Amino acid sequence: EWMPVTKLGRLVKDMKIKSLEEIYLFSLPIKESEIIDFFLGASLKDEVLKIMPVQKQTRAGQRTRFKAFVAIGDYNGHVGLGVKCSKEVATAIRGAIILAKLSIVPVRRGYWGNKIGKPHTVPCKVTGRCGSVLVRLIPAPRGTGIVSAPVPKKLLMMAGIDDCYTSARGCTATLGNFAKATFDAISKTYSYLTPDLWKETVFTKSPYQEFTDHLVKT
Amino acid sequence: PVARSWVCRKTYVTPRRPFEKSRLDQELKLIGEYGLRNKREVWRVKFTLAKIRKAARELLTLDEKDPRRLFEGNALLRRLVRIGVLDEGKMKLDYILGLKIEDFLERRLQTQVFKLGLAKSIHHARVLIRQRHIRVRKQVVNIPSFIVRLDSQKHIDFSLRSPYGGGRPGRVKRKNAKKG
Amino acid sequence: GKCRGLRTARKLRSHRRDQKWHDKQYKKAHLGTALKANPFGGASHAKGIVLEKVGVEAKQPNSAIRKCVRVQLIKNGKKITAFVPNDGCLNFIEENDEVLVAGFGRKGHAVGDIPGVRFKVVKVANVSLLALYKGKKERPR
Amino acid sequence: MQNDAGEFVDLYVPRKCSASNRIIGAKDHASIQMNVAEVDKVTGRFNGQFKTYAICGAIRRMGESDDSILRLAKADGIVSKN
Amino acid sequence: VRMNVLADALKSINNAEKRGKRQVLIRPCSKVIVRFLTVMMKHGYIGEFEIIDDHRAGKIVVNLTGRLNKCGVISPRFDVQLKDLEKWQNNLLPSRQFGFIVLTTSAGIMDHEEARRKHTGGKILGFFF
Amino acid sequence: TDPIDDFQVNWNTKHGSGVTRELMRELNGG
RNA sequence: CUUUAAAUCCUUUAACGAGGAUCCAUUGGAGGGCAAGUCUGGUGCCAGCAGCCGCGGUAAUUCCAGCUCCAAUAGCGUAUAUUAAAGUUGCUGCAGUUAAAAAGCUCGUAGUUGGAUCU
């Protein structure tokens, strides 16, 4: 099975964290991928964006390792991206899947014009940057689809963004920086202070405080 | 100087990327579902929908109580409702952007002939239409892309001169009965 | 930085017009010197007379002998070396006959390992090289 | 967060910093949520209730988390005026 | 030299909001600065401000609610017609749900929504969101 | 033929490009 | 002889007209970019392919072919000019320490820009 190593993992396994949004609310770090496996479960669909073989020069020759770029996420508002480099492709893929699970962030969806139905696009213009690669996401009308390059399109579809406008600048040919910039732009959606979020924050008890008695009762 | 007219217009647009797997799979799914001849029919319906969406967008940018917005929006909504791609209940400019390509492909005469039981399959529907076996109201229609209106939906009959809804046997049946 | 004033239109326009001459494509397409140096003279194709057959050696990384023909254009009398594309197609060409020659696909630039060749033979003796290659047509008698 | 029908459509409502009124991100692991115990007016003992101040990691890094918590406590009567 | 005191005021407000400060001191003050600040404050972005009267050109201390993402000036002040306003909002605003373009019109200094309500185009002063 | 093994062996040969394509097919819908 | 100034054509009605329904669809490709074979035979840095990277030096995923596969389809390939891609001409909207780049320096006319303040 799974023996939790962290307090958060123990709270999640003993069915007292209702949703993944509590941990996001209290900004706690996820160090066990089994928490994400417990909350998102079978809704998560991962895929390998790229396997980049990187070589280190040695006296005998070149030492080759393979870096796996993996994007994961249910198509409903959660997306993650994980990069792991290993001596073998299968190990790198497993590690990148674990890291992408650990890096899952909540995605905020919005409306382009009239607010009818479920939110379909990004709430506003967001920009992500990773080593000269700038990715800009612009709200798009319903039914537009993702107007983007294949890598940002894959990440945005995995994030559940129905339709979006995209701009890119810099060496987007480097898939890792392109994907990381898209992930940064996607994760900036919930950090953006819009007027609908001006309402004063009402604090609730932290999972570590609200369930401290259960933690110490062991 | 001639008394002719050179007003012509291409009815489709070619995709920007010739070879991408998702688009190819989706368009082949559409062709198989609706019995189309090539990707150009898919692109033609796509172009129609894209023009409609562009018009709806440009109207939605206008003032809500703009006389031109009101007039052209009601015209476009009536045109969409008339052919049955839009519900009469949801007649607003924002519901146009919710339309998909399949909503338009369902209104072809091929689809309506297959769905009304006149044909065994969508391909049988296409060959039935192309072989002058189908009429809409009193007019024999020969074009499978005929977009059936809502008022003509209940008038897609089996013609009157075809052996299937008429009564004169065809060439093959007459020849084979003549060899009895 | 750039000037941002309501009355800076002339400065912006003149600066853009002067800076466009530092664009390679713009200078090439608007100076008119590349047009007079073009053997085709702005045309897509040209007809010439095969002066001789020549084999040009491929560029260093790979080894081959490229079957070309030295042709003289009819419009201006300029001398041209044109690649005969497929194999055996040099045998379809005889010395001192008319050939239709097009560009090599890079707009006056040499293509591939063939050095200093930017033209290719399309038709010979008013029959296409592809019809001769595929056997659809024979060389006229 | 609210559509035209009035239903709430956000995944969750993120915390805002008690000092800067900026959203605290889901991956801001330098942010804190401090509880300050409330005390009886005549016994000076824990009441079982507290006051919560959320400080983001940007304020912590720049060193004004202490001054922000001090001002929040002063503006709440936990810390004596002057 | 210092031209376009509105640009300096808006840059100071933006820089102080990035730094997380509660108050910013703006100098010199001007009528256009006060009108822009009033338009900002009516929408809840900036809160109360006080005009210090030195006998030459005022200074303004502006309280800062942490609601402001960016305030910017548009230089030069392009004349904007009511038919070109939508293009300006698409160029300048993060979305169609929030964010304002401040124009100066013969009906006064107001945001783009009011300018469309009053059927007036004008000259673009800046924006805030 | 293991697509992963082929990638680990001769990704840096004449067949590296085709071997990469076969690897992407095995992993996802690439 | 409907059509038309005599007429062809579309339309209309009749008589024949489909089972390799031989009433036989092509054009370019199959390493990547880019969709689709490190299958077989020949060739052996030759012939050739290859827009670019590259393929070919007797076990070629790339040439010449057979088969099979896929892209568009009565249409496909090629050469040029041109637009988008090009935020690689940048007004929106580029860049100028080291990648190409701020004049050796300072005055200076035109040009451009110009502090508060009137109900």
Rounded to 10°, the helix B39-60/B67-82 angle is 150
Convert C50-82 into a string of H (helix), E (strand) and C (coil): EEEEEEEECCCCCCCEEEEEEEEECCCCCEEEE
The count of domains in chain E is 2
Q: Which residue of C has its CA nearest to E74?
A: C4
Residues 6+ away with beta carbon under 8 Å from C113: C58, C59, C61, C62, C64, C66
Structure method: cryo-EM
The count of domains in chain A is 2
Assess if residue B2 is contained within a domain: no
- Tell me the chain A residues in contact with residue D33 when contact means C-beta distances shorter than 8 Å: 26, 203, 206
Place of tokens 């006064």: E108
Assess if residue B38 is contained within a domain: yes
Domain that holds residue E120: 69-129
Supply angle C-alpha B174, B175, B179, rounded to 5: 115
Supply angle C-alpha B117, B123, B128, rounded to 5: 65
- Contact assessment for residue C119 and residue C113, using Cβ atoms and an 8 Å cutoff: no
- Contact assessment for residue E36 and residue E46, using Cβ atoms and an 8 Å cutoff: no
Q: Strand G: which nucleotides have any atom within 7 A of a protein Cβ? A: 12-14, 16-17, 19, 28, 31-38, 45-57, 61-64, 70-74, 78-82, 87-96, 102, 111-118
A-contacting residues in E 56-115 (Cβ below 8 Å): 66-67, 69, 94-98
Query: Do residue A129 and residue A100 come from a single domain?
Result: no
Question: By CB neighbour count within 10 A (0-12 exposed, 13-18 middle, 19+ buried), where does A90 fall?
Answer: middle
CA distance D81 to D64: 20
Q: State the best of E18, E22, E95 to mutate against chain D, taking most chain D CBs within 10 Å.
A: E22
The count of domains in chain B is 1
CA distance B71 to B78: 11
Nearest of E57, E66, E92, E65 to residue E78 by alpha carbon:
E92
Query: Do residue A47 and residue A132 come from a single domain?
Result: no
Domain that holds residue A96: 1-106
Chains contacting B (3+ CB pairs below 8 angstroms)? A
Token pair, residue A208, equals 């570590």
Q: Would you put residue C87 in left (φ > 0), alpha (ψ -120 to 50) or beta?
A: beta
Q: What is the DSSP string of B119-143?
A: SSSHHHHHHHHHTT--EETTEE---
Query: Do residue A73 and residue A152 come from a single domain?
Result: no
Strands (E), B16-154: 135-136, 139-140
Containing C34, the helix (H) or strand (E) segment is helix C33-37
- Contact assessment for residue A5 and residue A118, using Cβ atoms and an 8 Å cutoff: no
Strands (E), chain E: 23-26, 49-52, 59-63, 71-73, 79-80, 100-105, 108-111, 122-128
Assess if residue B6 is contained within a domain: no
Domain that holds residue B129: 18-180
End position of a domain, from candidates A88, A106, A124: A106
Residue E103: give its domain's CATH number. Answer: 3.30.1490.10
Q: Would you put residue E103 in left (φ > 0), alpha (ψ -120 to 50) or beta?
A: beta
The residue numbers preceding gaps of C to N over 2.5 A in chain F are none
Put simply, whether A69 touches E (Cβ < 8 Å) is: no
Q: What is the DSSP string of A168-189?
A: EES-TTSHHHHHHHHHHHHHTT
Three-class secondary structure of residue C101 per DSSP? strand
Put simply, whether F18 touches A (Cβ < 8 Å) is: no
Put simply, whether E3 touches C (Cβ < 8 Å) is: no
Whole-angstrom CA distances from D41 to D45, D74, D81 are 8, 16, 16
Alpha helices (runs of H) in chain D, residue ranges in sequence order? 57-62, 65-74
Assess if residue B9 is contained within a domain: no
Query: Do residue E86 and residue E124 come from a single domain?
Result: yes
Put simply, whether A116 touches B (Cβ < 8 Å) is: yes
Q: Which nucleotide is at minimal CA–C1' distance from E34?
A: G116
- Contact assessment for residue A178 and residue A121, using Cβ atoms and an 8 Å cutoff: no
Put simply, whether A112 touches E (Cβ < 8 Å) is: yes
Residue E98 has, within 13 A of its CA and on its CB side, a CA count of 22
CA distance C129 to C135: 10
Residue E14: give its domain's CATH number. Answer: 3.30.1370.30
Assess if residue A205 is contained within a domain: no
Query: Do residue E84 and residue E64 come from a single domain?
Result: no
Which pairing describes strands E23-26 and E49-52: parallel, antiparallel, or unpaired?
unpaired
Query: Do residue E123 and residue E85 come from a single domain?
Result: yes
Q: State the best of B53, B94, B95 to mutate against chain A, taking most chain A CBs within 10 Å.
A: B94
Residue D71: give its domain's CATH number. Answer: 3.30.1230.20
Q: What is chain C's length?
A: 141
How far is the first Cα of chain B from the last one, in angstroms, to the nearest whole number? 64
Nearest of A67, A161, A77, A72 to residue A112 by alpha carbon:
A161
The count of domains in chain D is 1
Token pair, residue B120, equals 């065994």
Query: Do residue A11 and residue A83 come from a single domain?
Result: yes
The 10 Å CB-count burial string (b at 16+, else e) for B83-96 is: bbbbeeeebebbbb
DSSP label at A29?
P
Out of A48, A53, A64, whose CB is closest to F27? A48
CA distance A98 to A82: 7
Place of tokens 């697509």: F3
Protein CA at C112 to nucleotide C1' at G50, angstroms: 7
Partners of C14 in the β-ladder: none
Domain that holds residue D50: 1-82
CB contact under 8 A, A51 and F28: no
Residue A72: give its domain's CATH number. Answer: 3.30.160.20
Q: What is the DSSP string of E15-52?
A: HHHHTT-SEEEE-S--HHHHHHHHHHHHTTSS--EEEE
